[PDB]
Symmetry: D2
Subunit: 376 residues, 4 copies
């Protein structure tokens, strides 16, 4: 039961930046790595695909690709001079497109494809071709501004897909929940004065962009109350995210009445990610997906699209991504998470949990969110 579309294309795994040691450009005092290049490597997303295959999950999904984003679709958010600058740099072996936004040769075409998968996933779910969808969109989108590449993002994938969906289906209320561990600054900025898109970011306080918390950035004018930042304390794990979901996200969704929920799903909150300091395990991602699927079922006829964003642990992202897809599809594979029990033991102690919970209660009050129970 439940029909889940899995939007995937092998060519998304061929995007590759020049030499980097994690996030640091090679050059100067940064030695080229012998093996592992840029943090946003193909391997993180590849290993997820490979585990879906060997576990039997891929066979139970509707595996689909899609055409690349048209220039028309891209131009709804990005200017033509940005497209031209990107293509030119892409045609000259790659280089630096923005702040922490290195591209490689042919990255332009691959970024168009990534955007296209997101466009197509929202389309398929709005058209009723599937109940929900997972789009393995690499390179990612959540940090990209209209006029500026950043945080490994070159097009604003989700915003492009939403604008295309509005043009084609006339959906009026879309909620974007971004549980990537970093702040979804691209989605926030694009929809900041808009009430047709509710953007919620759970992120590690001050991680990326560095030093940004944003609790008081709730949107402006027409968009006031339709952006919500939940800056979680570094070191939090399962309980911190469960409390955020229950006290902030679910109430915010209840009030907004989404016709479609899009999840910007990074897995970089996992307990072994190099690019954040949070302590999630695969069952945390499973539980967040269960809660958002339920919200989608109550508000949006089940219409839910999960778009892959970050996740930089080659070893562990596969197990987290697999838990999300199992929950979307309602299929339980024989896969057992070999780090689950270990990560359980590393969780914050009761005093730390109490401290974070109290902050979240205060934040819910500050946002004016009523603690109601779910209903039809």
């Amino acid at each position: 039961t439940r029909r889940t579309a899995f939007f995937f294309d092998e060519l998304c795994l061929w995007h590759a930046a020049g030499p980097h040691a994690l996030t640091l450009p090679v050059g100067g005092w940064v030695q080229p790595p012998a093996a592992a290049g840029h943090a946003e490597s193909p391997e993180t997303k590849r290993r997820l695909k490979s585990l879906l295959d060997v576990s039997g999950l891929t066979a139970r999904l509707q595996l689909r690709s899609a055409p690349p984003a048209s220039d028309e679709d891209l131009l709804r958010v990005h200017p033509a001079h940005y497209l031209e600058r990107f293509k030119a740099l892409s045609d000259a072996g790659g280089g630096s497109l923005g702040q922490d936004a290195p591209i490689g040769p042919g990255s332009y075409e691959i970024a168009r494809l990534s955007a296209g998968l997101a466009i197509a996933a929202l389309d398929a779910v709005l058209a009723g071709e599937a109940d929900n969808a997972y789009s393995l969109s690499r390179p990612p989108g959540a940090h990209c501004l209209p006029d500026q590449a950043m945080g490994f993002c070159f097009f604003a994938n989700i915003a492009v897909a939403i604008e295309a969906a509005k043009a084609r289906h006339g959906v009026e209320r879309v909620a974007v929940l971004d549980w990537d561990v970093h702040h979804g600054n691209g989605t926030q900025a694009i929809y900041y004065r808009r009430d047709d898109v509710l953007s919620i970011s759970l992120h590690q306080d001050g991680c990326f962009p560095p030093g940004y918390s944003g609790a008081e950035d709730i949107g402006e004018d027409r968009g006031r109350g339709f952006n919500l930042n939940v800056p979680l304390l570094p070191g939090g794990g399962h309980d911190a995210y469960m409390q955020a979901m229950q006290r902030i996200v679910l109430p915010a969704l209840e009030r907004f009445r989404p016709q479609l929920i899009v999840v910007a799903s990074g897995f970089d909150a996992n307990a072994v990610d190099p690019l954040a300091r949070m302590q999630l395990h695969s069952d945390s991602f499973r539980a967040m997906t269960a809660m958002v699927r339920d919200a989608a079922e109550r508000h949006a006829g089940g219409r839910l699209v999960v778009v892959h964003e970050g996740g930089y642990s080659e070893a562990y992202v596969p197990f987290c991504g697999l838990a999300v897809i199992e929950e979307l599809s309602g299929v339980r594979s024989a896969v057992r998470d070999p780090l689950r029990d270990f990560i359980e033991l590393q969780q914050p102690n009761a005093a730390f949990r109490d401290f974070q919970r109290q902050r979240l209660e205060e934040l819910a009050a500050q946002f004016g969110l009523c603690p109601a129970q779910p209903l039809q």
Copy 2:
């Protein structure tokens, strides 16, 4: 410009486990990595050495190697059957020597060399051949128990070094400060009932061994009050460690009056390490080294040895290790940490810092350090 001995052997970088994805052994659901093997890779330690060379710092250090640890030295802490067991598995091409303790072909002889470098570094500093020393001892030592390999450690390098030092030189009070992000359980266990060795561990609360905090474990009988665990909240960074150093570590060292300070220096509290959740930058490790070098100058005649332990960020461990060595030597290279400013902006907010600070005040009071 002090005299710093740098103990290093290229062959320590040749120890390699079987296929792993981070800490997970390949097999079952864990696919073999296309490139990046076990977390405890040669590359983290090699890249420190490479940056030490390209910066020119190596030319300002006293470069040394050492013989492998003798059976005599190893046998002060490990039984003969452990050595036998280890060697057999090593000669057979490797495998699992214990819990999270995989070994590869020849890992036995390489582990003996790692231990030997630790032995030699303490010796050189105690003999007056250098003011202080850094030992690039891979594989690491601080989790290894007398008859149980664990946490990627196969001999208890520091314990072996200390027992060897005591036999040869007759040093009476040694302080071991372990700022590796994980609990120094091996050092703690070996010296738990002893007052001639003060063991202090700074670690992420519950990280490794998983779920272990340990604030209440202060030693027993003769050792009571000569073990200190400071379980820091996950997510803490520079201020949390500076507060732990000022409130607990330095007062503890003052009270103990060590004649030698050994640091179990893991860099895995760095802000981009996969194996912990702490937020240190290179200047944090610089600052901790300055604080401990000062304690060593006050009580130990400058006698400080830093033994390299963990650190699993290939990109960032080199900058942190270099900061330590710059501080030990008193030489500042041209190297500039390209992540430092970024990491400063990611630090805990004031409320989180205050929360951790109050916790450290209470722990300092529990330890009788007020």
Copy 3:
């Protein structure tokens, strides 16, 4: 546009040996690689599959998997104690199953799957489910003897496939053409005294097994004249292989009238392979496949199965394997081989070509093919 079945299982790409530098086991003087492990890596086979997907060719093929080979199937060629021995070493985390035959954790079950894909590919073609087939059977099979793993091969995939086919379908004459650059010693040995299987090996003279040429080894008793070795001079390329195909292989197949042709298709004769010294490009493999598909259409009702064997250039095997599959399917993708023109310019000069040609004329005459 013919009907081509592509047998593939992602799990075949999860077999991985312990640490090796190319073919050398790590240990002693061979330092662990910073990234690039054993020559028989997942990446060569994975990159073929990735290019098949990005080219869109996969959408024009009949994609299939298979059950692992049963004990019954394996036991037609291998003894139970071999299976036991293999499994024990696999469950223990791997090691050396034979001479140049390292295995990793779970390699036993993965080798059974590799064999299963070969069994299924022959079955599908014999049952009329496809006109022809390609099996991405990793680990490979052509060097494995009944009770001796060697040359990175742990079961004799093709022999197991053939024996299974004979039991189920009752095919009487099978031709095995092995254009892997190394000698197909396992296939040769198993069928040496048999006339129901014609084994032909094209290989680099003396490459692997090292020093073996074998022109004189034509089979014995009932098998006499049903084994042909063509030991090509190292350094030969396209013309050497085209001459071997026209003068020896095609006449041999004509004489034998196979009812099924199986190709042991290694790509290790490619011009940038580390494990041989030959100079083939993707159009050479395209041409050899066209020639054998034609022989199969003439005698075997089109029944041709290509089993993937060697190929150790990550960069270039994908283009060569794609050319084969394009030829089998009759579909031409948009893919253009970026090394082809370069390799054409590197070919043997006319004097070297003439030298090799005269050698092949004489060998053809020795074989009674004039």
Copy 4:
């Protein structure tokens, strides 16, 4: 006995091109590699250094670095606009400097250092600071033209070093023996009309540059008879090289009377190299080094410099490089070549050897070389 200078700098191992699969630029149909990048990787040269260290050889050599090449030194062969174009591309994250000549960020400074090590090695040997020298000059030099980067080479290291040595010491007769498996086209072109430099290339017929043999290219006018190409048949190994050394190289050296011998020492003729089809083992390189050391001792007061060029087998180049340095230093380590015996068995058969030998006899006759025996 014998004092061997080993010119090395760790920073030479930090030169790294953008993503390549062997020699193929990533992009289009060439997928980015998961691990191993460009063929000219740091690892080949690093593993040689590591083996020198663990074997005890490094401790028995005079380990030295040197300043980078000055613009003055570079300008003796390269134009200022070439230096400027290189630096600009190097400062912008790298890219393509020529045909099969990709550079990375900071490659300019590292290439200057590589040239500087070569300059310094010739200087040290001409000054009598050591009997002979080995320079681990990465990136390599032998393919670089004055006006054009190629074959992974960005400065003409050996030519730069020779021109500097002539300016500083006034050496009049330098022989460059290039046993890298590819044609030393840079050295050939620069000295093609010169009789003060004898350039000899042993190379696989038609390998790199592709299709070039060059037996009839013997130099012109003043340089006629002071360039010699020995195009060996692909597939040849130990005997083919021994015959070439005995029938061509030694006689050519005898006639020329070098005051200094420089060896452009690539190890890409090794039996497992991806970038050529030849079958040398470490004892082949040992024997070639012994013969050239002897020639240097008879003609040049022992003055011999070996400059690292190619070699693309991570596994095997270390054992070959180690054999050369053992022979230069006269120190025999405990290292045993684990592929030696295997490669012995793969050698060409007697008919193939006879075919190549006869070609070499005919070539010696064509060059007008008399088969004399060595003497003082």
